[PDB]
């Protein structure tokens, strides 16, 4: 990172939309019920040809399927340069979907949390505990300077306070500056101490149906809808995919290249 000096009289360059469409890849994540309703084995080819009409080279649009929001929330691996997640809306899962967005619309720096030997705390409002697995049931016992527990006994987990049960993904936020003993099913869950660095610009979430319920910020005073959080009413999935294809330029305009240099181990679908 170096200072960048620019002249306000500089001329705008031509549109780079065609070049980025040519040199980038698009990943679409949709629920399995979409494929079920569409009921066509060649719909991937059809959408690829339509995207080609929109400018994307054949083979650069990758279609990925997930069973549901809860299943997809277990270590979501976003591959392409541009990722669009068609997330079905369920009034009962408002938190979970929000968490999923909170997981994929932001960059997270995470380190392992070996709870069974160590005591942990959250240093600042950017710190959270992200737990992912088949079943994440997390109980918390706040502690104090004398190392005793408040309304909890370290020797009896039954007295721990319940913050998660049977979760595929959950973001736990506790009071900062306080040590907590943790009890999570390590067999079916992995908990990580994470810091949200900032927005993840290459991931857009399109909520299919419902209303604006997403809250990607733990602060109760903010519920910001960024340009990467779209929301479309629906009755047929074919119309949903047609509107995704037709307004692909608008969707990618709302997104930007990831720009982060990572330390992780994930594959990517790039050109």
């Amino acid at each position: 990172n170096l200072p960048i000096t620019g002249s306000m009289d500089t001329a705008y360059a031509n549109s780079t939309q065609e070049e980025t469409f040519l040199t980038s890849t698009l990943c679409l994540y949709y629920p399995t019920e979409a494929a079920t309703e569409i009921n066509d084995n060649s719909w991937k080819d059809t959408l690829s040809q339509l995207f080609l009409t929109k400018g994307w080279p054949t083979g650069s649009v990758y279609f990925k399927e997930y069973t549901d929001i809860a299943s997809f929330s277990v270590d979501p691996q976003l591959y392409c340069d541009y990722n669009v997640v068609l997330m079905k809306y369920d009034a009962t899962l408002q938190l979970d979907m929000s968490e999923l967005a909170d997981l994929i619309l932001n960059e997270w720096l995470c380190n392992p949390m070996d709870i069974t030997l160590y005591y942990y705390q959250q240093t600042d409002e950017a710190n959270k505990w992200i737990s992912m697995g088949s079943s994440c049931t997390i109980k918390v016992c706040p502690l104090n300077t004398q190392t005793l527990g408040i309304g909890c006994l370290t020797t009896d987990t039954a007295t721990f306070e319940e913050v998660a049960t049977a979760e595929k993904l959950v973001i736990t936020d506790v009071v900062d500056g306080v040590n907590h003993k943790l009890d999570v099913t390590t067999a079916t869950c992995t908990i990580r101490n994470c810091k949200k660095l900032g927005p993840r610009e290459n991931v857009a979430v399109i909520q299919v149906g419902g209303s604006d319920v997403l809250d990607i910020t733990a602060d109760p005073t903010t519920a910001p809808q960024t340009e990467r959080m779209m929301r479309i009413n629906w009755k047929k999935w074919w119309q949903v995919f047609y509107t995704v294809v037709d307004y692909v330029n608008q969707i990618i305009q709302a997104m930007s290249k990831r720009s982060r240099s990572l330390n992780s181990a994930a594959f990517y679908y790039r050109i």
Binding site: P3, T5, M8, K196, T217, T222
Partner: protein
């Protein structure tokens, strides 16, 4: 130059003072000077023009002297004087125009037109008399190698530059820290912006700096410093440094903190004003250093607290601005300013006669290019042409 100025001054005084009914006692010395000018110029042939579309004109001087035995001037005397005055004024105007459109790199202070070079001969020094105008006075001081001085109201010392520097940037341009400025003429507006409102800053303070180098030393300068930059206080879409994309700026103005304006000469602090606004005096300087701070308000009302959240997205971007206007200054070099017309005169003469671009000045006499690269040769040529323009303005 002194002889050309003296011709112009004699002609102007003749126009002003040789009037019907005036006592000869009021013009006796002027009439003697005028007759001396006639005697000196008689029998001399001159040629002006021949550059661009400026026409070649031949000048012959064979004139009679003015009478000296009148008690009061009458109509006949005035018309007899006016014929010669008209011819001489035309000659002086053409010589000035011929000199204004020419330039040289090595010796641009010296006369370039053949007419003015001929007028620089010793025999013409008899024409020379009172050199009282500011520009001819500075010309004579320069020729004597004395300290020169030009007073400028709103000196045009800053070349036009609307620019920005991003000290913190991302491809999405949503968490931007930096500063944007306009330098134009005698005016410097600067504005430091933090999109996060210095929430993650060490002491919740973001330090902004702006250094402007003046191409010439300004002395005895009166400046007005104001705590807001109205030029960068409204929302705008700004090109990226490479022009590849455009970012959004949505200012919300907070008063600048620990404002410190330093006027430096050769890297030495001459003047320093902290938290001082209104009229200040910079006695001698060539560089301006404006250092200000964005301090996050420790206490916020619910609306102000709503403006600045803990983390992104940042929709309202904190901005602190400074305005610095040089109202008057003194410079040892010639500059275009708001009150004078020499730059306008030289540019007008060069444009009207379609003078090809020379090796000294930028095309079209553009001031931004001239002051950006204000070399000593350009200063020599500019002083010469500005002095000629001032001489011409006495008559035309």
């Amino acid at each position: 130059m002194d002889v050309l100025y003296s011709l112009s001054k004699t002609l102007k005084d003749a126009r002003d003072k040789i009037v019907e009914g005036t006592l000869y006692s009021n013009v006796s010395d002027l009439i003697q000077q005028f007759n001396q000018m006639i005697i000196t110029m008689n029998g001399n042939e001159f040629q002006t023009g021949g550059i661009g579309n400026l026409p070649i004109r031949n000048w012959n001087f064979d004139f009679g002297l003015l009478g000296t035995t009148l008690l009061n001037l009458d109509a006949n005397y005035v018309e007899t004087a006016r014929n010669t005055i008209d011819y001489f004024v035309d000659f002086v105007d053409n010589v000035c125009m011929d000199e204004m459109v020419r330039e040289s790199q090595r010796n641009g202070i010296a006369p370039q037109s053949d007419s003015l070079r001929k007028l620089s001969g010793i025999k013409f020094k008899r024409i020379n008399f009172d050199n009282s105008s500011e520009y001819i006075e500075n010309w004579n001081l320069q020729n004597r190698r004395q300290r020169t001085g030009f007073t400028f109201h709103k000196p045009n010392i800053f070349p036009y530059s609307a620019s920005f520097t991003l000290n913190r940037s991302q491809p999405a341009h949503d968490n931007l820290m930096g500063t944007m400025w306009l330098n134009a003429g005698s005016e410097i507006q600067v504005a430091g912006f933090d999109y996060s409102c210095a929430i993650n800053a060490p002491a919740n303070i973001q330090q902004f700096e702006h250094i402007v180098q003046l191409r010439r030393v300004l002395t005895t300068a009166t400046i007005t410093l104001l705590p807001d930059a109205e030029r960068f206080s409204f929302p705008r879409v700004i090109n990226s440094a490479d022009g590849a994309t455009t970012w959004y700026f949505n200012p919300v103005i907070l008063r600048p903190n620990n404002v410190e304006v330093e006027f430096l000469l050769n890297g030495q602090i001459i003047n320093t004003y902290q938290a001082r606004f209104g009229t200040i005096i910079a006695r001698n300087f060539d560089t301006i250093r404006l250092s200000f701070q964005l301090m996050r308000p420790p206490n916020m009302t619910p609306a102000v607290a709503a403006l600045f959240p803990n983390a992104q997205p940042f929709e309202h971007h904190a901005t602190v601005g400074l305005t610095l206007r040089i109202e008057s200054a003194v410079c040892e070099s010639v500059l275009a300013d708001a009150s004078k017309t020499m730059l306008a005169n030289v540019t007008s003469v060069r444009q009207e006669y379609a003078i090809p671009v020379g090796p000294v000045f930028p095309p079209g006499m553009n001031w931004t290019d001239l002051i950006t690269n204000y070399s000593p040769s350009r200063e020599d040529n500019l002083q010469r042409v500005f002095t000629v323009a001032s001489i011409r303005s006495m008559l035309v």
